[PDB]
Design a protein around this motif. Structure first.
Motif, short mmCIF file in Angstrom:
data_model
loop_
_atom_site.label_atom_id
_atom_site.label_comp_id
_atom_site.label_asym_id
_atom_site.label_seq_id
_atom_site.Cartn_x
_atom_site.Cartn_y
_atom_site.Cartn_z
N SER A 164 -69.10 9.45 24.82
CA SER A 164 -68.98 9.65 23.35
C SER A 164 -67.90 8.69 22.83
O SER A 164 -66.73 8.83 23.20
N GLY A 165 -68.31 7.72 22.04
CA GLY A 165 -67.41 6.71 21.43
C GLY A 165 -66.61 5.91 22.38
O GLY A 165 -65.57 5.33 22.07
N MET A 166 -67.05 5.84 23.67
CA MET A 166 -66.31 5.20 24.80
C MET A 166 -65.02 5.97 25.14
O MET A 166 -64.29 5.46 25.96
N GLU A 167 -64.90 7.18 24.61
CA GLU A 167 -63.70 7.98 24.79
C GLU A 167 -63.91 8.99 25.85
O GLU A 167 -63.02 9.13 26.70
N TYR A 168 -64.99 9.75 25.81
CA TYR A 168 -65.16 10.91 26.72
C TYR A 168 -66.49 10.76 27.42
O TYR A 168 -67.49 10.40 26.82
N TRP A 169 -66.42 10.97 28.73
CA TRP A 169 -67.57 10.73 29.64
C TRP A 169 -68.16 12.03 30.10
O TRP A 169 -67.44 12.98 30.44
N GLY A 170 -69.49 12.04 30.19
CA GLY A 170 -70.18 13.14 30.92
C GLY A 170 -69.99 13.04 32.39
O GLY A 170 -69.27 12.15 32.85
N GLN A 171 -70.49 13.98 33.13
CA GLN A 171 -70.25 14.01 34.56
C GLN A 171 -71.14 13.10 35.31
O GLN A 171 -70.91 12.95 36.55
N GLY A 172 -72.11 12.49 34.68
CA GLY A 172 -73.06 11.60 35.31
C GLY A 172 -74.31 12.20 35.83
O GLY A 172 -74.28 13.37 36.18
N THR A 173 -75.37 11.42 35.86
CA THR A 173 -76.68 11.82 36.37
C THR A 173 -77.08 10.75 37.40
O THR A 173 -77.16 9.58 37.09
N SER A 174 -77.34 11.23 38.61
CA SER A 174 -77.87 10.42 39.69
C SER A 174 -79.35 10.11 39.48
O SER A 174 -80.11 11.06 39.25
N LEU A 194 -59.36 5.39 34.27
CA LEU A 194 -59.16 5.83 35.66
C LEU A 194 -60.26 6.77 36.07
O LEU A 194 -60.52 7.74 35.33
N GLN A 195 -60.85 6.51 37.22
CA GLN A 195 -61.82 7.41 37.81
C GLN A 195 -61.21 7.91 39.10
O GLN A 195 -61.05 7.17 40.10
N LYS A 196 -60.84 9.16 39.08
CA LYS A 196 -60.31 9.80 40.29
C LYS A 196 -61.48 10.08 41.22
O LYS A 196 -62.65 10.26 40.76
N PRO A 197 -61.22 10.24 42.58
CA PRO A 197 -62.34 10.40 43.52
C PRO A 197 -63.22 11.60 43.16
O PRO A 197 -62.69 12.69 42.83
N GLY A 198 -64.54 11.37 43.11
CA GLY A 198 -65.39 12.45 42.83
C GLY A 198 -65.59 12.83 41.40
O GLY A 198 -66.38 13.70 41.09
N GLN A 199 -64.91 12.13 40.50
CA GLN A 199 -64.88 12.54 39.08
C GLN A 199 -65.49 11.40 38.23
O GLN A 199 -65.88 10.35 38.70
N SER A 200 -65.56 11.66 36.95
CA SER A 200 -65.99 10.61 35.99
C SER A 200 -64.75 9.84 35.55
O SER A 200 -63.63 10.29 35.67
N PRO A 201 -65.00 8.66 35.04
CA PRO A 201 -63.87 7.91 34.42
C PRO A 201 -63.30 8.70 33.26
O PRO A 201 -64.01 9.47 32.58
N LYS A 202 -62.02 8.54 33.01
CA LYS A 202 -61.29 9.12 31.90
C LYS A 202 -60.50 7.99 31.24
O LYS A 202 -59.98 7.11 31.94
N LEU A 203 -60.43 8.03 29.92
CA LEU A 203 -59.65 7.03 29.17
C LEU A 203 -58.15 7.25 29.39
O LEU A 203 -57.67 8.34 29.21
N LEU A 204 -57.47 6.17 29.77
CA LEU A 204 -56.04 6.15 29.92
C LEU A 204 -55.30 5.50 28.80
O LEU A 204 -54.36 6.06 28.24
N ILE A 205 -55.67 4.26 28.53
CA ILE A 205 -55.02 3.41 27.53
C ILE A 205 -56.08 2.81 26.65
O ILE A 205 -57.08 2.28 27.19
N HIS A 206 -55.85 2.82 25.35
CA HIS A 206 -56.76 2.22 24.39
C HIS A 206 -56.02 1.14 23.55
O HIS A 206 -54.82 1.31 23.27
N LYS A 207 -56.71 0.04 23.31
CA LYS A 207 -56.22 -0.99 22.40
C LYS A 207 -54.92 -1.46 23.02
O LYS A 207 -53.86 -1.43 22.35
N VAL A 208 -54.99 -1.91 24.24
CA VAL A 208 -53.93 -2.59 25.00
C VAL A 208 -52.82 -1.67 25.55
O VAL A 208 -52.57 -1.73 26.73
N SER A 209 -52.24 -0.86 24.69
CA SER A 209 -51.02 -0.18 25.03
C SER A 209 -50.94 1.25 24.57
O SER A 209 -49.94 1.87 24.83
N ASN A 210 -51.90 1.77 23.84
CA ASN A 210 -51.79 3.15 23.29
C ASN A 210 -52.23 4.17 24.37
O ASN A 210 -53.37 4.10 24.86
#
Lengths: 206, 218, 11
Positions: free
Chosen positions: A96-106, B42-58
């Motif tokens: 969603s908006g490159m902000e929040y990710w779903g868990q994925g689908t294989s 950052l994508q921790k093992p087994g998880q989805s990526p999560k946003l850490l930093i946006h627009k260089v430094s925020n």
């Protein structure tokens, strides 16, 4: 914000799949983006959709073989992915908006129907000993592998399954003291529910 | 499309270290409108990526102070001060300046350092059960080694066999920071019976020479 | 729609 994606898909080369992404927690305020994660962890943006108005933008690599839609009645986004090949065996995310990710689908692409493995005990050749178990030629994921019904859990390496020539292989090693084996029994237990497989293979000295 | 080059691609650190990841784009990410749409996940093992930093430094919602983003134009850096376990995983940079498509860096794996460890190598002839099938798989486990890079060859009667090899590798062990690998050579039973000497050979930083385990079929 | 991370995408 929570994005609930649909479960694993399995198709033959050439076919298509339709995967969903249910959003909760403003569905119409964010473009729904889609991203493939390939086996070596690289990421490829497929495209995005505006859910109020329905406009779309695609990666040209995916244009013509992927179609994005939404249903506003249920705040659900969809991706129809056509022309499947082995390169499409991957994990697909809605974002969603490159902000929040779903868990994925294989999505797994293989020419194989559901196939039972053969399961082989691996005894050493002939202070510690390493034993193995080989689970050869099954489809689809997953299998479950334990040693001594889960009682023997330390000193184990169960390797990720790898798809090759349309079927999976998986293996597992277990390391125990020489005072433990062969004087005490060690058995690998394998289940592949999709094929109604359930096998116990005692590791016997050759 | 914009090529996003990350370096290093694997970053072993010790707990409490400062970690630095570079991301360089093939063209400038400063947009005509003044913004630089460069983000870090950052994508921790087994998880989805999560946003850490946006627009260089925020820093995004809930992201610790110890993550900071810097850089400009084509050259960006993520810095992770006082690395802890929860920081381990794959870091990606992403650009949304030149689109479509959005592009991503290949991912930098933040991993733990430990002392070098030679693999424990075990080789397994086909089981008697498999032999009754007309296939023959030989398995080699190369267990509990460090560092992660390893290369394995199968040699049959002293000659490499490339076809029929299936390799699988574990992620870093959570308890002792080692890596393990399985390699399975599959032959027909008739090919298996044409040769007598089977060897699993690895190269690895821990030895200048090949590391070998072998058996004779009879 | 215009979103802050994505610039000109769909915007």
């Amino acid at each position: 914000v929570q994005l609930l994606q649909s479960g694993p898909e399995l198709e033959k080369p050439g076919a298509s799949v339709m995967i969903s992404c249910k959003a909760s927690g403003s569905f119409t305020g964010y473009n729904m983006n889609w991203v493939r994660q390939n086996i070596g962890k690289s990421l490829e943006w497929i495209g995005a959709i505006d859910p109020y108005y329905g406009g779309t933008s695609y990666n040209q690599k995916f244009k013509g073989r992927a179609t994005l839609t939404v249903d506003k009645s249920s705040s659900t986004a969809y991706m129809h992915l056509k022309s499947l090949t082995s390169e499409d065996s991957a994990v697909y995310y809605c974002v969603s908006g490159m902000e929040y990710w779903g868990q994925g689908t294989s999505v797994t692409v293989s020419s194989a129907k559901t196939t039972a493995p053969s399961v082989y005990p691996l005894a050493p050749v002939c202070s510690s000993v390493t034993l193995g178990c080989l689970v050869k030629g099954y489809f689809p994921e997953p299998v479950t592998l334990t040693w001594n019904s889960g009682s023997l859990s330390s000193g184990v390496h169960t390797f990720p399954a790898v798809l090759q020539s349309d079927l999976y292989t998986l293996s597992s090693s277990v390391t125990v003291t020489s005072s433990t084996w062969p004087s005490q029994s060690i058995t690998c237990n394998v289940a592949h529910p999709a094929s109604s497989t359930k096998v116990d293979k005692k590791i016997e000295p050759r | 499309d914009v090529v996003m080059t990350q370096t290093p691609l694997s970053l072993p650190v010790s707990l409490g270290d400062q970690a630095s990841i570079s991301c360089r784009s093939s063209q400038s990410l400063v947009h005509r409108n003044g913004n630089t749409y460069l983000h870090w996940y950052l994508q921790k093992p087994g998880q989805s990526p999560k946003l850490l930093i946006h627009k260089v430094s925020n820093r995004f919602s809930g992201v610790p102070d110890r993550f900071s983003g810097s850089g400009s134009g084509t050259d960006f850096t993520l810095k992770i001060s006082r690395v802890e376990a929860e920081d381990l995983g794959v870091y990606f940079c992403s650009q949304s300046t030149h689109v479509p498509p959005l592009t991503f860096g290949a991912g930098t794996k933040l991993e733990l350092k430990r002392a070098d460890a030679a693999p424990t190598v075990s080789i397994f002839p086909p089981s008697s059960e498999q032999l009754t099938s007309g296939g023959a798989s030989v398995v080699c486990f190369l267990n509990n080694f460090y560092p992660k890079d390893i290369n394995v060859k199968w040699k049959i009667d002293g000659s490499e066999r490339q076809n029929g090899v299936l390799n699988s590798w574990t992620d870093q062990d959570s308890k002792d920071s080692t890596y393990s690998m399985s390699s399975t050579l599959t032959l027909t039973k008739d090919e298996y019976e044409r040769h007598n000497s089977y060897t699993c050979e690895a190269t690895h930083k821990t030895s200048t020479s090949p590391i070998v385990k072998s058996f004779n079929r009879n | 729609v215009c979103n802050p991370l994505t610039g000109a995408l769909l915007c």
